[PDB]
Design a protein around this ligand. Sequence first.
Ligand SMILES: Cc1cn([C@H]2C=C[C@@H](COP(=O)(O)OP(=O)(O)OP(=O)(O)O)O2)c(=O)[nH]c1=O
Ligand SMILES: [Mg+2]
Ligand SMILES: [Mg+2]
Lengths: 394, 557
Amino acid sequence: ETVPVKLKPGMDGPKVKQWPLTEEKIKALVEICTEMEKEGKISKIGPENPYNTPVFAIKKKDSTKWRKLVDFRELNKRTQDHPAGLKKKKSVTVLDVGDAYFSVPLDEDFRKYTAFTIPSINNETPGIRYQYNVLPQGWKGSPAIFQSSMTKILEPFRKQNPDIVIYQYMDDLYVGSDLEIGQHRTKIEELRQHLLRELHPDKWTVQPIVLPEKDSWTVNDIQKLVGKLNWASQIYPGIKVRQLSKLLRGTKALTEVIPLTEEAELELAENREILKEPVHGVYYDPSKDLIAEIQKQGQGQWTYQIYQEPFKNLKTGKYARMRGAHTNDVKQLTEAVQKITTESIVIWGKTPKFKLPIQKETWETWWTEYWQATWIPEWEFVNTPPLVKLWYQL
Amino acid sequence: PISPIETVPVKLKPGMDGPKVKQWPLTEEKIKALVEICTEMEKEGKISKIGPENPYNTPVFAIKKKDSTKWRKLVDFRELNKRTQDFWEVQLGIPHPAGLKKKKSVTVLDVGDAYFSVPLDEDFRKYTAFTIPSINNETPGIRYQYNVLPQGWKGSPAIFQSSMTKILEPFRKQNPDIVIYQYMDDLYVGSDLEIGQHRTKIEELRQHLLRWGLTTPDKKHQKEPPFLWMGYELHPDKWTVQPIVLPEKDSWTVNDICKLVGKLNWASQIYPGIKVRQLSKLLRGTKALTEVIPLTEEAELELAENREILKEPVHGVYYDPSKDLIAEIQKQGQGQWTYQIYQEPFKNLKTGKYARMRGAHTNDVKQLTEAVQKITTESIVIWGKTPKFKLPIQKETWETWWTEYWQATWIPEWEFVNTPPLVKLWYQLEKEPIVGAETFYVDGAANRETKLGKAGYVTNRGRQKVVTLTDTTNQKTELQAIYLALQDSGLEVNIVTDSQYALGIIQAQPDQSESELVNQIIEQLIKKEKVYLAWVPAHKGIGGNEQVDKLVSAGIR
DNA sequence: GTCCCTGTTCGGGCGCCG
DNA sequence: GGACGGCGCCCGAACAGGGACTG
Ligand SMILES: Cc1cn([C@H]2C=C[C@@H](COP(=O)(O)OP(=O)(O)OP(=O)(O)O)O2)c(=O)[nH]c1=O
Ligand SMILES: [Mg+2]
Ligand SMILES: [Mg+2]
């Protein structure tokens, strides 16, 4: 028996056009949907259902199976409406328990809102439309509705291990412990056996604003430094640029060498210490979105900030692959986005809205060739001013 | 006959009612055509006489078909269409001959009176009420409703496409290795069978369709090459487009231009080198379809080159999945590009053109990256995979740009092709300030009320200049200051600006802009040997920024 | 807030197909 | 002539941001 679910008042369902898929993905989706239909989990529908949500597939790393992935971001936006100790465990593994959802029916009046359309190569046939009969993977309501059965299945494992932390975010179980990695993997297999019925969050580090060290300073150097500190004073009111700026009175050449006074040297060491302290007065508000910004720093380095109001950063970090003879910017940006989403889910149990430093078209052309998660965060695209790139540079 | 398939339930939009619209006057010829069609359809139960219990009506007319003998009955359902529920369209695109694979045997066939074989939902039938006007003074006019899909209703294309997919599903499951391209009711059928066994399978298919109420009249059953399909001619090893006729008018209106541009875009799929930049620019700010625009000389020449290109013979080939897909890109001016997709050297699968202007300011590497993106999603639609590229850009140029550019940008497996015009960066900003180059501190100010402003610079060697401007903006004064520093500097210059607007533009290394003033700047930057551009926060007393700020604020702030 | 400048979306012509 | 849906192209209108102003 089903649980009624409604939409947020005054909101119609999703009407997103399906995007083109490669042959691999189409073949996988067609076989997966065929099986899903033999089992009653989805049903064919026609064009009198006016709703649509895109669909694709990911081939997991060295797994010979594919996984369907519905992009339910709009539907989740439109559907009616956290263990702090998880961020501290020595090791955390992430299980894909979306399968469970196929055991629970879905309120009939809701089913039409989960429509999706398989496309065809070279448009040989019209698209072929389906809708859901059970809890769909990647839908905000699937974990909400299955929560009670989930708690029931987990009660004994949590009793026999109260030192293990289990958290559920939509299609995913996060399991954390303080075990040697062999014993941790053994406990994880215990949990996967019971469910027939590697992260290390304590090593994530903050990337602080950092100032150059020099024995000889030019007008150019000091001008760049004053601009960087002027910017950083909006995050740290301790910062001051009076004396350093005083060194620049007049109209000097950019390469003139400037000797630093005692006052300016003091100011610089003070500012250098102020940037050590953490950002004061920043409290997480759950009823607002996490904003993630990423800046490409070049040579495989990327920097990111998670905040909710401008200059009030909840976290700042970097992702750094090794320098690239055959480096792929879009693949790296996708990896950065998945890593950051993982961290935000673990810490605050919520995904950020990403501002991506890439063209809309480039991203949409390629990002699904590197996606490996079961959720998809919201994003928008920006044309970053290389100033901020210089600001957070390492 | 009428398909025994289940109907598709449909509904009006909430709080809405059926149309009540007067039949208009039709010519006598169309009234005879309609009369014959209607009494025949009535005998077959496709339309039913209605009485005065039905309050609705909507106008009806008729046009000749492709076959100029036969008529086509149409209904202006624009009102009912407004008042009808939404559908999700299921036709996601248009099949393309370059995506077809070589086949031993081929058949093209068409369904007869396709729409009129698919039942319409009973609850909705009353809204389709129409009236055939009196052909006589002595004969009155008959009123009917539809029991099958009518032409002119907004729900018919999708309902028919869906019904056809359902009807063909059993045959496909049973015959997975026979390929049926299904464009509304056109069927291309390909098999790897000898002609006899193939014809037997085609008879199976015809009877399968007939069981579901769809006839395949022999008149449209093509059995020998060349096949006429989707606007093309399909020969056993090559395809072509059915000929393009460009108009030859002497006066040209907007509508004439749109026709010309449309046919050229159609032609570029297999003709290499089509250009529409100038012809298209001709449409800017035009009033309406009737406005006569006179051809520029640039558009004149463009059209001449296109006409020549069209006088040539050209064809495509079919797809071999066991070979790579290769796209080769060629530049033309004005942000225009053509491409050829092929597998063996001089046998194109297809061709195309990319010309879209994205953004106020851009350069040729950006444009090439977006041409690559367009071709990649086109390839995924038509062949389901990404091609290998051959681009007129050196690996060092790409490397440099990808280093210097702050955005994520990427291009799949590719190889340098030495066919000019090569794509290059036309200048490069320094990363460090330049020893021996004079240092300019530039700034602009503008009064938002009167729109008067000043641009100018001071240098570390004592030069000072201020230029006054009328009807300008802050952003524009900043750009003018940079232009001035470039005009008055040597081959090597350090420039310091307070304006992150101007810095963000100039830093992305544009070679084209819709702004004249940015074009003039770009020209200067190409003339230089070394340029270095630093930034400082405005209004903080820093360095030479202060002097020039006080100079340009004088009579404006 | 306002003015500027720049990006995306959508709708309106046309091409082509049925 | 003229009705419908699909994709393509191109242009302009109506938005949505983000940065810099006035006293
Ligand atoms: C060409 C065309 C078509 N249609 C609809 C209706 C029939 C299907 C198929 O078109 P068709 O094969 O040429 O017409 P059809 O009704 O089948 O008549 P015949 O094929 O028997 O001549 O698309 C339409 O609504 N407007 C059009 O202009
Ligand atoms: Mg037909
Ligand atoms: Mg300024």
